[PDB]
Design a protein around this nucleic acid. Structure first.
Ligand code: K
Ligand code: K
Ligand code: K
Ligand code: K
Ligand code: K
Ligand code: K
Ligand code: K
Ligand code: K
Ligand code: MG
Ligand code: MG
Ligand code: MG
Ligand code: MG
Ligand code: MG
Ligand code: MG
Ligand code: MG
Ligand code: MG
Ligand code: MG
Ligand code: MG
Ligand code: MG
Ligand code: MG
Ligand code: MG
Ligand code: MG
Ligand code: MG
Ligand code: MG
Ligand code: MG
Ligand code: MG
Ligand code: MG
Ligand code: MG
Ligand code: MG
Ligand code: MG
Ligand code: MG
Ligand code: MG
Ligand code: MG
Ligand code: MG
Ligand code: MG
Ligand code: MG
Ligand code: MG
Ligand code: MG
Ligand code: MG
Ligand code: MG
Ligand code: MG
Ligand code: MG
Ligand code: MG
Ligand code: MG
Ligand code: MG
Ligand code: MG
Ligand code: MG
Ligand code: MG
Ligand code: MG
Ligand code: MG
Ligand code: MG
Ligand code: MG
Ligand code: MG
Ligand code: MG
Ligand code: MG
Ligand code: MG
Ligand code: MG
Ligand code: MG
Ligand code: MG
Ligand code: MG
Ligand code: MG
Ligand code: MG
Ligand code: MG
Ligand code: MG
Ligand code: NA
Ligand code: NA
Ligand code: NA
Ligand code: NA
Ligand code: NA
Ligand code: NA
Ligand code: NA
Lengths: 114, 57, 128, 123
RNA sequence: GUGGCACGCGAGCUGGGUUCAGAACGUCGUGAGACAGUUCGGUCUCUAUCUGUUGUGGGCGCAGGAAAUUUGCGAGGGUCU
RNA sequence: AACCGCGAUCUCGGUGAAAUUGUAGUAUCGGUGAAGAUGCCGAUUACCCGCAACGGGACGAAAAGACCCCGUGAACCUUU
RNA sequence: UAUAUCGGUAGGGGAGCAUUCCAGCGACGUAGAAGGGAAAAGGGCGACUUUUUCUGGAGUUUCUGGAAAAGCAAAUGUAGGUAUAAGUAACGAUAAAGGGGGCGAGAACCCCCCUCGCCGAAAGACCAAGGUUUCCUGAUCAACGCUAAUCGGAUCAGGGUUAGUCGGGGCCUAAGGAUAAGCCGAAUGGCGAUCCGAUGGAAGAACCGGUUAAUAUUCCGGUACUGAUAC
RNA sequence: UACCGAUGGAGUGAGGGCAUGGGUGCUAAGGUCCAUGUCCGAGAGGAGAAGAAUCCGGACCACCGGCUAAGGUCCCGAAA
RNA sequence: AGGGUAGGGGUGAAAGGCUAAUCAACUUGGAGAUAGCUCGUACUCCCCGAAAUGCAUUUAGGUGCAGCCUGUUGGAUGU
RNA sequence: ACCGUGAGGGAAAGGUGAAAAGAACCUCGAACAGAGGAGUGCAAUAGACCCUGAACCCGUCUGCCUACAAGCGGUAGGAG
RNA sequence: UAAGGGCAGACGGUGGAUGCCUAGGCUCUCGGAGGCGAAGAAGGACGUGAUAAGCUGCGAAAAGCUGCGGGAAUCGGCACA
């Protein structure tokens, strides 16, 4: 018998083209252009999921550095003192305390200020 | 000589920005109460500056 | 009964719209669209004067379409329109079927000529 | 550049332009008002007022000078007959140009040019 | 003056030279033909999209709307004998 | 070299093609690099959109280089 | 349950999804099938799958097994449709146009008049080849006409070509061709003196005038002539 | 921890850079010909401004947790 | 104006000119000739994973056999 | 059909509705050119190119953004 | 302030994909039959209707003429008379 999968073949394209809405010009709707654009974006997304962790750690470190300099120390000295004293609070929590709970950050600094 | 690439819809529309039909310069002629082109003979009554210029029987 | 119900809903909706259409006008949609953009949003009597004295060829057909739309409004509202009451509330120009022609070119080559048509739609309403 | 060049060529060779001006002048003398393009009427005014001024000297010499421009004996007879007596003692400005509208076929700006003393309504 | 810029520059020009089909001389080859050679003749295509460059406008901005006169951040020209 | 005339050209009304075209919000300099960069790096410059004019670049368009070599490809020509 | 392992081109291996049709078993559908638009949810993972709603208005589908015209992004790939360059090149000889009236809803271009210009061993008037109704009139302006058009060699319908003397044919032969008697030759056939064959030779034989929207040496009025046929 | 027998299916038979030992070349070449390793080929991630094979390091997927490599801690740019 | 010469055949005051815009003809068929050459080859996830060397070859950008991969099996031996 | 002197080559083109019941009549307009109505019909967004009516391509409206800004146009963050 | 532009949604336009449908193809099976023509063939030309004929039929007796058998109310072929 003769088999042509017209509906399935068209439905695959339509499903992918729902994902390329918002793109610029022909890259949103022209299919060969749109499908080309969408796959390069997927490679970018794989790379950026890895880079997001580095970016957020850098942001935490910068906020901790500013709060430590307000308290009288630097980031490297503060982190060395915390590691020596065995305090396991991570940089995300430390940055959150520095931004939003300065009294708690101050007590943490005063703990290792010796 | 030859376009290296086709123009996008955006580029074409940006060029067409200055394509516009011109509005005619229309005066009202309050006596006859209808439009005509400023500095022309009012084609309905045949008047111009309050004087019969063209007489239509 | 489904399509009958849908048609009845649409027929009730059309009673509150006042519009006229020109279909298959054998002229360039782009050149017609210039005139449409000139008169969009404008009071009807001024629009009639503008179309009467415009320097574009398409304005002559747009003027008769506008007169037809005003007449449709008058019939649907069962009264004559007053002075400055109506305005061009919507206008659009779409492309229509193209006639394809062949024109000879040097050295035996033949090139295609497109003779384009358009549709025009005009909605009038009151400046409420 | 065309600094101080003071006549319109009207898209014609010189002989064609002169012949057209002569024909227009005869038509304007015979029928007292004609409908033309605005540019042609403005050129015709400069051409035709000196010819009308020449009738203020009623002489065979002035008749021959006018005929050298017209080459139309009917127009010459009408001009040195009725037109002369009508435009007598008017110090120039015998014609008037009024704009009317635009042509369908090419959008040309149209007007009429007329002899002033034959429009009673405009005095 | 000496050099660089695709020995600058043929979508700027030219076509003397060079690459082509005709023909001839010298030389080589049995020949078809050939040449550290010579000689006469021999179609130079494209409507400028992007960028670049030379000019000239429209829009908006500059605390609300304007008419004038201006300072000069800078740029270019000039520099021979 | 200057000037002149008409046709083309420019502006307006009517009709309306083509070659070309992966998508483009398509700047400069020096670097780098499949060794000659609008698209990478570091700087620099640059308000948004047209029109006229010129051809430096887009190794611009055109015909799967005719030169060169290759194929146990082809044709035609010569000959002891 | 632990430990170990899990980057990959050529390439080898494994396990699946969708599509068309068939058998068996179940089902759905005018109280709305397939298809098309929108939205939501799901899958060790994925190919894909469910559900809601609008359009649509008549068919579709689950599981198990069977069979294939069984899946596209590129081949200077093919068909159809639509873009870009672009409202750009161009509208086809630089013999040239101006005005007044008419008709018409609409006029630079159509009709009439005046003026202007071009050809005039032609761009005037005829015969032949070739074309084949393009000729004239009434309606029509969709398409065709490189613009518009009331106009046209355009569309539709009606009309229009009249010969004893004009042209041809009937008659004759040239080149050449087809043949007879004969000759040659695997076949199909090839030759070969009467016939065919004009571009040539005979033709049996007029003009004048008038008349149609469109034919005229053909129709008509005169004037003639030619060939056969019965006394 | 997968080396041999026998069998089913292959692809490859244009390699390249670096280090080391040499020939050739001019102790030239991002040159060329062998040998021994290694990497790119078929290999992403980090530093070196940007660099196929130099320095570090072999990516099952997710994480807004932590420790390190080479290399760094004045600002662009994480840390004296 | 009519006629004749037809494919490597005709014709050529000779250029390999011309033989219906085709010439070191056209149409149809053998025919889907052959092309060790170029280009192209479409759903999904999982496991493994090379070579660009040697020998031979009218062979050198092709191929045969080794070398190096993979599946399934039986032995112990590989680093 | 078309192309070619000829031998020969050689297309594109199906679907209103159950039934023509195929839209009397009115309005704008020179005109159905076209449309708005009325009426028929289950349905006219089934109105003659007429079932369904996708993409490319072309418009209108509404929301947000945009005239100090520079590279494959996404991707990961993130106010209003 | 948006001259213009970008994205999204809604709604249209164009175009004619898709789904559904079809006696138009394709491959076969069985049984026949395997020619037509000088009593003029195959294949054509011109005609033929109340009204122009594009097909179909027919042939100056021209969408038809005669006889026998069958059948019983419509018929006067198709291109929406
Ligand atoms: K089905
Ligand atoms: K190409
Ligand atoms: K090697
Ligand atoms: K050998
Ligand atoms: K329907
Ligand atoms: K139906
Ligand atoms: K649609
Ligand atoms: K972005
Ligand atoms: Mg990390
Ligand atoms: Mg413009
Ligand atoms: Mg048109
Ligand atoms: Mg006009
Ligand atoms: Mg020609
Ligand atoms: Mg000129
Ligand atoms: Mg040079
Ligand atoms: Mg050149
Ligand atoms: Mg150049
Ligand atoms: Mg030679
Ligand atoms: Mg010469
Ligand atoms: Mg120009
Ligand atoms: Mg124009
Ligand atoms: Mg460089
Ligand atoms: Mg550069
Ligand atoms: Mg480039
Ligand atoms: Mg090139
Ligand atoms: Mg090549
Ligand atoms: Mg790993
Ligand atoms: Mg793997
Ligand atoms: Mg429903
Ligand atoms: Mg297939
Ligand atoms: Mg496909
Ligand atoms: Mg090409
Ligand atoms: Mg241009
Ligand atoms: Mg041309
Ligand atoms: Mg032009
Ligand atoms: Mg003549
Ligand atoms: Mg005629
Ligand atoms: Mg007529
Ligand atoms: Mg026309
Ligand atoms: Mg006619
Ligand atoms: Mg004879
Ligand atoms: Mg005649
Ligand atoms: Mg080899
Ligand atoms: Mg080798
Ligand atoms: Mg090397
Ligand atoms: Mg490789
Ligand atoms: Mg490796
Ligand atoms: Mg640490
Ligand atoms: Mg820092
Ligand atoms: Mg030669
Ligand atoms: Mg030839
Ligand atoms: Mg064979
Ligand atoms: Mg072949
Ligand atoms: Mg082979
Ligand atoms: Mg592995
Ligand atoms: Mg092998
Ligand atoms: Mg009409
Ligand atoms: Mg519908
Ligand atoms: Mg439909
Ligand atoms: Mg700035
Ligand atoms: Mg801003
Ligand atoms: Mg917008
Ligand atoms: Mg749509
Ligand atoms: Mg009979
Ligand atoms: Na010799
Ligand atoms: Na102010
Ligand atoms: Na497999
Ligand atoms: Na003739
Ligand atoms: Na004839
Ligand atoms: Na109607
Ligand atoms: Na806008």
């Amino acid at each position: 018998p003769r088999s042509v999968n017209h509906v399935a073949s068209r439905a695959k394209r339509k499903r992918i083209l729902k994902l390329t809405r918002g793109y610029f010009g022909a890259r949103k709707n022209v299919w060969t252009v749109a499908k080309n654009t969408w796959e390069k974006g997927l490679t970018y997304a794989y790379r950026d999921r890895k880079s997001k962790k580095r970016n957020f750690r850098a942001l935490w470190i910068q906020r901790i550095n500013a709060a430590a300099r307000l308290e009288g120390m630097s980031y490297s000295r503060l982190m060395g003192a915390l590691h020596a004293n065995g305090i396991e609070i991570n940089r995300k929590v430390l940055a959150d305390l520095a931004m939003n709970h300065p009294e708690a950050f101050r007590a943490i600094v005063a703990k290792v200020k010796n | 000589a030859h376009p290296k690439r086709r123009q996008s819809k955006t580029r074409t529309a940006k060029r067409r920005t200055h394509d516009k039909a011109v509005m005619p310069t229309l005066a009202k002629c309050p006596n006859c109460g209808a439009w005509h082109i400023y500095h022309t003979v009012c084609g309905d009554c045949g008047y111009y500056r309050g004087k019969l210029a063209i007489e239509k029987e | 009964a489904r399509k009958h119900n849908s048609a009845e809903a649409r027929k009730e909706a059309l009673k509150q719209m006042y519009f006229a259409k020109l279909r298959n006008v054998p002229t360039s949609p782009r050149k017609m669209r210039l005139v449409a953009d000139m008169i969009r949003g404008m009071e009807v009597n001024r629009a009639l004067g503008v179309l009467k004295f415009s320097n574009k060829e398409a304005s002559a057909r747009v003027e008769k379409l506008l007169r037809s739309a005003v007449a449709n409004w008058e019939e649907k509202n069962e009264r004559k329109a007053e002075e400055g009451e109506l305005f061009v509330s919507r206008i659009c120009v779409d492309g229509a079927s193209t006639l394809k022609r062949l024109r000879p070119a040097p050295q035996g080559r033949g090139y295609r000529i497109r003779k384009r048509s358009n549709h025009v739609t005009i909605y009038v309403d009151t400046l409420n | 550049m065309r600094h101080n060049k003071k006549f319109n060529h009207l898209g014609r060779k010189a002989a064609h332009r002169k012949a057209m001006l002569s024909n227009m002048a005869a038509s304007l003398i015979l029928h007292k008002r004609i409908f033309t393009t605005v540019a042609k009427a403005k050129a015709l005014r400069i051409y035709v007022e000196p010819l009308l001024t020449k009738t203020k000297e009623d002489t065979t010499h002035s008749r021959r000078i006018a005929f050298s421009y017209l080459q139309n004996k009917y127009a010459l007879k009408e001009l040195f007959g009725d037109v002369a007596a009508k435009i007598a003692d008017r110090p120039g400005g015998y014609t008037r140009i009024l704009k009317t509208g635009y042509r369908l076929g090419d959008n040309a700006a149209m007007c009429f040019i007329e002899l002033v003393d034959y429009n009673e309504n405009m005095l």
